[PDB]
RNA sequence: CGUCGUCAGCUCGUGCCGUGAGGUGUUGGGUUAAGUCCCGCAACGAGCGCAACCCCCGCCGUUAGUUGCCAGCGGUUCGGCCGGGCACUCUAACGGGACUGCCCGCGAAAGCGGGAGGAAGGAGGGGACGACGUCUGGUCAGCAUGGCCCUUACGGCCUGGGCGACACACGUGCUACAAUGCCCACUACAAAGCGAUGCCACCCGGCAACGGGGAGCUAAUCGCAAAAAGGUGGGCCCAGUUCGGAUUGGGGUCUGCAACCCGACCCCAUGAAGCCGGAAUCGCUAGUAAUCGCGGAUCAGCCAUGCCGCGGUGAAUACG
């Protein structure tokens, strides 16, 4: 058990926070829990949408919430009778009456969180873990990218003895603080246990 | 020192005499990094030599050191059996370190209650050719030579 | 008229002003022997002047804040030597061989975790 | 080297429950869980059954043992 | 004379939010007191890396609060125009005390 | 030493004040 | 950290002393930083993502 | 997450060798902190790791100046206090600078030795960062989770007790055995932090802990705050001591609904072992060790001598 989160490790450089708002030793923790409550439902609901991310900005009872997804349409709803019920949830929790944008993702094959979700999915439908991975890396690596890697945890194939499946292409230099490597995890639940899935995508250096 | 041959540290010259050999001696006296208290001690001990003696302290100091320098010492070694104390010459660098160390060590074993009083009397006895310092120095050379039988083990 | 040179050491800055005249050194107002009341050290801080036979040529107004008197002492060593080179650049050719020009970089090593003091590692039982 | 300040603490459970018994007479024991409360004058004579986490032990309050607390007489542990 | 401290978690979220008040005032008021830094109040957090035992690792976290000054000399009028709602920062706090 | 409450150092080390270490 | 104990949140403590922090994200009762209301473990995790704004990785 | 281990390694693609497991490359010579680089070579390249990119510290410059300063002048209740000024310090944001670039020597090359210039020189100092994998390592008591198991209860509430028991044994530490010291008085130098129902200047009561009163501060402009070791003067005079503060008696403050079990703190008294520690064993190679103090997290308060961090003073030694 070594190596740090490639994100927390790059927050300074090539990677910004999922919440960029100021506060003080009396506010912060509150505006904090809020975001957690936010993504709470968002991730419980917009799963099918393709919940690639949930950014949250602030100013004063104002909150950005630029929820990114691969299939924006699934957010909107019948004409828009959902992104009306979602904006509804906003004040349902915190009566801040804020925005709630939506931004499609330019190729969900470069969105590690998704790339991992995909793989996590397949694993639950009882797919071939190894191929699923061979393929994933391929897609991700296919639609551009300079490198990629995927890692499913243990109990592969329902095995009684946990293992750790690989697969990786191109470059995925982690020790290089400036690679800009998307990272995504996916907790693939299952009938015999849990299977962690991690995805990394290397794109552009300097 | 497995890679390189550690270069001897180069210390500044004595604030007063400008002698590096003295700064050394001071550092040895120093304990808990109180170079002041140290430096002080030494100097007051240099004055106690001005009175109780004739010549300037530096002269005595130099002489004292020069008498405590062992020109031979025994160093243990393992050889099919036990540990055979092998006599070998003592380098110039170590010759000094051992002298200054032994001075302070012998010095602080003295009965006089004042630090400076002890250093001065030891330097004096040392410069004269007596005192625990010179003793050890002789004790070593006694060990050495007296084990010449093993001398053919050199290093 | 006047000459200046900063000078820093082990985290302590010093303002040095060399003005022709006797040699009265006013560190934080007080006289040299005032601020450095019985510290065999001090003296050194004036070694840059003696290095060029001066000393009895300039009076010196000095300020200092940060660290400890010995640190401050060293800083001065730099200042007095720094200002002295400005005053006359031909003085660098003499203070370099003695290195009063260099800024002693030795600082305090950070206190690492796991260890007791940066390097002093905790002891352990029969391993 | 004791301490309290001003307001010698006593739990009302018995403070009143005891000062009432005075208004009448002596009572056959008085079990309580407030081993905190300070033993005050108007107790000398009564027999308070102090608990110890398992037992309700009887304690005959005497003058000499006023300033003390209840627990000091109802020992907690059991030793070798 | 316009005290206006700026405090953000980013040294550009402020250095921008302050670069506005810099020229959007020079173009309607005196040269202004320019933007002034001010020491930053850093907060470290030291947690044991892994859960359960292994108390000799930790890893460090810091949440540094930067500060800005500014101060527009002369409480102008036309300066207060281009400086009324032409902001751009998202993660900043700005107290006004002219 | 640092362990004698009734001393200057005793108060310091034990991070406190009182007679033996008053706040000026 | 059984729900039956995450009940604490309930104001009515009986006495202001009996109150305690507890992670707002896991229920963790020990090492629960105030400024975040999070536990040492939780702090670590979120911080790594980006859910903790301004919060970075200190080095010096 | 720990660990081997920041160790100098682990591999892949294609070609080539072998029936084959595999081999070559990655071996060899030179070199390096390093599979770092150079040369050679049936291999030619690539990936993970090393290095670099990020942070802090050394020097310098610009932008900004309620930090700073008679640098320089005027006034001064002579406090950088008032005016004034961005010079210097500094605060914090950007940029410069070092590349074996240059000089001599050795070398096939890499690079090694030495020199100048330079704040800094050959990875300038310290961080973050820890490969394919190993230990059926650690944690289901952080959380998540397959399975099993209890469901008037293996669930829930409360009061009380326990986690603080002791004939003993070990680990990690603290204070110390003293004169390079202990005590009192006076006096001087720091960095990094923290502060609203909080830091609390200052005044008075109390030996005091602390209390009553109450100014300022959204904190480079107020407070915690005294830095300590140090310097100067004086006391002690070698003694279980003016060393050392255990233990115990007594009085009291403060937090808290409540300090018996089981809080810290102050004051009087008591004043223990301990005279430098057997066999054996631990840390550290430079501002490091040693030594001196300061802040913080958690936190009502606290059993912190612990932990994480900050600066003062500042060594010895390395043949091998
Ligand atoms: Mg230190
Ligand atoms: Mg710990
Ligand atoms: Mg649970
Ligand atoms: Mg509590
Ligand atoms: Mg808690
Ligand atoms: Mg290495
Ligand atoms: Mg091959
Ligand atoms: Mg064969
Ligand atoms: Mg073949
Ligand atoms: Mg092969
Ligand atoms: Mg091999
Ligand atoms: Mg081979
Ligand atoms: Mg090699
Ligand atoms: Mg390489
Ligand atoms: Mg400059
Ligand atoms: Mg060359
Ligand atoms: Mg690295
Ligand atoms: Mg096991
Ligand atoms: Mg389970
Ligand atoms: Mg316990
Ligand atoms: Mg004493
Ligand atoms: Mg009074
Ligand atoms: Mg100010
Ligand atoms: Mg004296
Ligand atoms: Mg006695
Ligand atoms: Mg005594
Ligand atoms: Mg004795
Ligand atoms: Mg506390
Ligand atoms: Mg206790
Ligand atoms: Mg402390
Ligand atoms: Zn938690």
Swiss-Prot record, chain A:
Superkingdom per UniProt: Bacteria
Record-linked CDD domains: KH-II_30S_S3
SUPFAM superfamilies documented for this protein: Prokaryotic type KH domain (KH-domain type II), Ribosomal protein S3 C-terminal domain
Gene Ontology biological-process entries: translation
Keyword Disulfide bond: no
One MF annotation (Gene Ontology) recorded for this entry: structural constituent of ribosome
GO cellular component: cytosolic small ribosomal subunit
SMART domains the record matches: KH (SM00322)
Family: Belongs to the universal ribosomal protein uS3 family.
Quaternary organization: Part of the 30S ribosomal subunit. Forms a tight complex with proteins S10 and S14.
Function: Binds the lower part of the 30S subunit head. Binds mRNA in the 70S ribosome, positioning it for translation.
Protein name (record): Small ribosomal subunit protein uS3
Top-level taxonomy: Bacteria, Thermotogati, Deinococcota, Deinococci, Thermales
Gene name for this UniProt entry: rpsC
Swiss-Prot record, chain B:
Region forming the signal peptide: none
Subunit structure as annotated in this protein's UniProt entry: Part of the 30S ribosomal subunit. Contacts proteins S9 and S11. Binds to the C-terminus of IF3 and to the C-terminus of Era.
Keywords: Ribonucleoprotein, Ribosomal protein, RNA-binding, rRNA-binding, tRNA-binding
Function: One of the primary rRNA binding proteins, it binds directly to 3'-end of the 16S rRNA where it nucleates assembly of the head domain of the 30S subunit. Is located at the subunit interface close to the decoding center. Binds mRNA and the E site tRNA blocking its exit path in the ribosome. This blockage implies that this section of the ribosome must be able to move to release the deacetylated tRNA.
Organism whose genome encodes this protein: Thermus thermophilus (strain ATCC 27634 / DSM 579 / HB8)
Highest taxon listed in the record's lineage: Bacteria
Gene name of this polypeptide: rpsG
One MF term in the entry's GO annotations: tRNA binding
Family: Belongs to the universal ribosomal protein uS7 family.
Record-given protein name: Small ribosomal subunit protein uS7
Keyword Magnesium: no
Stretches that traverse the bilayer: none
Gene Ontology biological-process annotations: translation
Gene Ontology CC annotations of this record: small ribosomal subunit
UniProtKB/Swiss-Prot annotation, chain D:
Molecular function per GO: rRNA binding; structural constituent of ribosome
Matches recorded under Pfam families: Ribosomal_S19
Keywords from the UniProt entry: Ribonucleoprotein, Ribosomal protein, RNA-binding, rRNA-binding
Oligomeric and partner information: Part of the 30S ribosomal subunit. Forms a loose dimer with protein S13.
Organism the protein comes from: Thermus thermophilus (strain ATCC 27634 / DSM 579 / HB8)
PANTHER family: RIBOSOMAL PROTEIN S19P FAMILY MEMBER, SMALL RIBOSOMAL SUBUNIT PROTEIN US19M
UniProt family annotation: Belongs to the universal ribosomal protein uS19 family.
Task of the protein: Located at the top of the head of the 30S subunit, extending towards the 50S subunit, which it may contact in the 70S complex. Contacts several RNA helices of the 16S rRNA.
NCBIfam families: rpsS_bact
GO cellular component: cytoplasm; small ribosomal subunit
GO BP term, example: ribosomal small subunit assembly
Protein name according to UniProt: Small ribosomal subunit protein uS19
From Swiss-Prot, chain E:
Assembly information from the UniProt record: Part of the 30S ribosomal subunit. Forms a tight complex with proteins S3 and S14. Also contacts protein S9.
Keyword RNA-binding: yes
Pfam entry (one): Ribosomal_S10
Cited function: Involved in the binding of tRNA to the ribosomes. Part of the top of the 30S subunit head.
Sequence similarity: Belongs to the universal ribosomal protein uS10 family.
Any GO BP annotation: translation
Source organism of the structure: Thermus thermophilus (strain ATCC 27634 / DSM 579 / HB8)
SUPFAM superfamilies: Ribosomal protein S10
Lineage of the species this protein comes from: Bacteria, Thermotogati, Deinococcota, Deinococci, Thermales
Record's GO cellular component terms: ribonucleoprotein complex; ribosome
Keyword Nucleus: no
InterPro entries for this protein: Ribosomal_uS10, Ribosomal_uS10_CS, Ribosomal_uS10_dom, Ribosomal_uS10_dom_sf
PROSITE patterns on file: RIBOSOMAL_S10
Xref: Gene3D superfamilies: Ribosomal protein S10 domain
Transmembrane segments: none
SMART domains named among the record's database cross-references: Ribosomal_S10
Name of this chain's protein: Small ribosomal subunit protein uS10
UniProt KW keywords: Ribonucleoprotein, Ribosomal protein, RNA-binding, rRNA-binding
GO molecular function: rRNA binding; structural constituent of ribosome; tRNA binding
């Amino acid at each position: 058990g070594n190596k740090i989160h490639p994100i927390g490790f790059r927050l300074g450089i090539t990677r910004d926070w999922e919440s960029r708002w100021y506060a003080g030793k009396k506010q912060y923790r509150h505006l904090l829990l809020e975001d957690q409550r936010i993504r709470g439902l968002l991730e419980k609901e917009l799963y099918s949408a393709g919940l690639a991310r949930v950014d949250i900005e602030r100013a004063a009872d104002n909150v950005a919430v630029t929820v990114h997804v691969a299939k924006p349409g699934v957010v909107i709803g019948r004409g828009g009778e959902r992104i009306r019920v979602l904006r509804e949830e906003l004040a349902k929790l915190t009566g801040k009456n804020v925005a709630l944008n939506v931004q499609e993702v330019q190729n969900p094959n470069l969105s590690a969180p998704l790339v991992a979700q995909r793989v996590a999915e397949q694993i639950e439908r009882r797919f071939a873990v190894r191929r699923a991975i061979k393929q994933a890396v391929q897609r991700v690596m296919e639609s551009g990218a300079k490198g990629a890697k995927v890692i499913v945890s243990g109990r592969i194939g329902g095995a009684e003895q946990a293992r750790t499946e690989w697969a990786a292409q191109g470059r995925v230099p982690l020790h290089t603080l400036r690679a800009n490597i998307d990272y995504g995890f996916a907790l693939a639940r299952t009938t015999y246990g849990v299977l962690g899935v991690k995805a990394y995508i290397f794109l552009g250096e300097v | 020192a497995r890679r390189r041959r550690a270069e001897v540290r180069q210390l500044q010259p004595d604030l007063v005499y400008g002698d590096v050999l003295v700064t050394a001696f001071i550092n040895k006296i120093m304990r808990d990094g109180k170079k002041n208290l140290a430096a002080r001690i030494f100097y007051d001990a240099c004055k106690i030599i001005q009175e109780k003696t004739g010549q300037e302290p530096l002269k005595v100091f130099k002489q004292a050191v020069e008498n405590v320098k062992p020109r031979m010492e025994v160093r243990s070694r393992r050889v099919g059996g036990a540990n055979y104390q092998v006599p070998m010459e003592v380098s110039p660098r170590r010759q000094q370190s051992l002298a200054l160390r032994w001075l302070v060590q012998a010095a602080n074993q003295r009965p006089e209650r004042r630090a400076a009083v002890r250093i001065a009397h030891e330097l004096m006895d040392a410069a004269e050719g007596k005192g625990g310092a010179v003793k050890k120095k002789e004790d070593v050379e006694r060990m050495a030579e007296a084990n010449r039988a093993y001398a053919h083990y050199r290093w | 008229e006047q000459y200046y040179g900063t000078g820093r050491r082990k985290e302590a800055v010093a303002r040095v002003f060399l003005r022709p005249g006797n040699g009265k050194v006013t560190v934080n107002g007080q006289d040299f022997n005032e601020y450095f009341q019985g510290l065999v050290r001090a003296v050194a801080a004036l070694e840059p002047l003696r290095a060029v036979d001066a000393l009895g040529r300039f009076d010196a107004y000095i300020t200092v804040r940060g660290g400890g008197k010995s640190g401050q002492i060293d800083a001065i060593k730099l200042g007095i030597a720094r200002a002295l080179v400005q005053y006359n650049p031909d003085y660098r050719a003499k203070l370099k061989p003695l290195g009063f020009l260099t800024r002693d970089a030795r600082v305090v090593e950070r206190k690492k975790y796991g260890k007791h003091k940066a390097r002093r590692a905790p002891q352990y039982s029969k391993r | 080297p004791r301490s309290l300040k001003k307001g010698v603490f006593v739990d009302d459970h018995l403070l009143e429950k005891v000062l009432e018994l005075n208004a009448k007479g002596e009572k056959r024991l008085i079990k309580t869980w407030s081993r905190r409360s300070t033993i005050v004058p108007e107790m000398v004579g009564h027999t308070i059954a102090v608990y110890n986490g398992k037992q309700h032990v009887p304690v005959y309050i005497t003058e000499n043992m006023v300033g003390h607390k209840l627990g000091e007489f109802a020992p907690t542990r059991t030793y070798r | 004379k316009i005290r206006i401290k700026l405090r953000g978690f980013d040294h550009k979220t402020l250095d921008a939010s302050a670069q506005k008040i810099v020229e959007a005032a020079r173009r309607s008021g005196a040269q202004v007191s320019g933007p002034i830094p001010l020491p930053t109040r850093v907060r470290r957090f030291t947690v044991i890396r892994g859960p359960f035992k292994h108390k000799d690792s930790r890893e460090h976290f810091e949440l540094r609060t930067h500060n800005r000054l500014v101060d527009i000399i002369n409480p102008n009028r036309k300066t207060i125009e281009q400086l009324m709602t032409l902001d751009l920062p998202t993660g900043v706090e700005i107290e006004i005390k002219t | 030493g640092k362990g004698d409450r009734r001393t200057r150092r005793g108060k310091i080390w034990r991070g406190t004040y009182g007679k033996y270490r008053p706040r000026k | 950290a059984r729900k039956a104990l995450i009940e604490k949140a309930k104001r009515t403590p009986k006495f202001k002393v009996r109150a305690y922090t507890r992670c707002v994200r896991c229920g963790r009762a020990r090492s629960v930083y105030r400024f975040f209301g999070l536990c040492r473990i939780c702090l670590r995790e979120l911080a790594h993502k980006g859910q903790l704004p301004g919060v970075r990785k200190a080095s010096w």
